[PDB]
Design a protein around this ligand. Sequence first.
Ligand SMILES: CCCCCCCC(=O)OC[C@H](COP(=O)(O)O[C@@H]1[C@H](O)[C@H](O)[C@@H](OP(=O)(O)O)[C@H](OP(=O)(O)O)[C@H]1O)OC(=O)CCCCCCC
Ligand SMILES: CCCCCCCC(=O)OC[C@H](COP(=O)(O)O[C@@H]1[C@H](O)[C@H](O)[C@@H](OP(=O)(O)O)[C@H](OP(=O)(O)O)[C@H]1O)OC(=O)CCCCCCC
Lengths: 41, 41
Amino acid sequence: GIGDPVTCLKSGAICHPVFCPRRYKQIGTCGLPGTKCCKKP
Amino acid sequence: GIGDPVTCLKSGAICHPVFCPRRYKQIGTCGLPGTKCCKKP
Ligand SMILES: CCCCCCCC(=O)OC[C@H](COP(=O)(O)O[C@@H]1[C@H](O)[C@H](O)[C@@H](OP(=O)(O)O)[C@H](OP(=O)(O)O)[C@H]1O)OC(=O)CCCCCCC
Ligand SMILES: CCCCCCCC(=O)OC[C@H](COP(=O)(O)O[C@@H]1[C@H](O)[C@H](O)[C@@H](OP(=O)(O)O)[C@H](OP(=O)(O)O)[C@H]1O)OC(=O)CCCCCCC
């Protein structure tokens, strides 16, 4: 899946530390420590 | 303004690294260098 910050932000998603914020679901990582790639369904 | 991660997330915003993603307004920081508190208008 997604594991780098460029692809994450180019896929309609955001990078967030630790956990994905409310209304976002985790779809991968952004390659940075403890950072998740997060997207609203 | 908002300057800690708790108040940022409890205000309906996100702590995004480096910059606020497209369509998010920066409303402060999450207390750490390189974190922006970003809220969707
Ligand atoms: C060169 C300067 C570098 C800084 C530039 C600052 C970057 C900046 O200000 O814009 C954000 C940008 C991506 O945002 P960008 O708007 O381009 O991405 C679009 C967005 O994902 C849309 O949701 C997509 O539409 P859809 O949902 O598919 O329908 C759209 O697809 P398409 O319509 O185009 O096909 C995407 O293009 O981020 C980075 O890529 C790398 C950041 C590095 C990560 C750092 C953060 C950890
Ligand atoms: C979760 C793990 C990941 C976390 C990663 C951690 C992220 C990371 O470490 O970088 C964030 C940092 C952002 O800077 P940062 O959030 O600290 O914001 C600066 C800070 O507010 C200073 O106080 C300001 O100076 P002053 O008070 O007014 O005197 C300064 O104003 P100015 O100087 O702008 O005028 C602000 O920029 O990076 C960059 O600068 C540009 C892109 C960096 C390169 C990246 C490009 C891809």
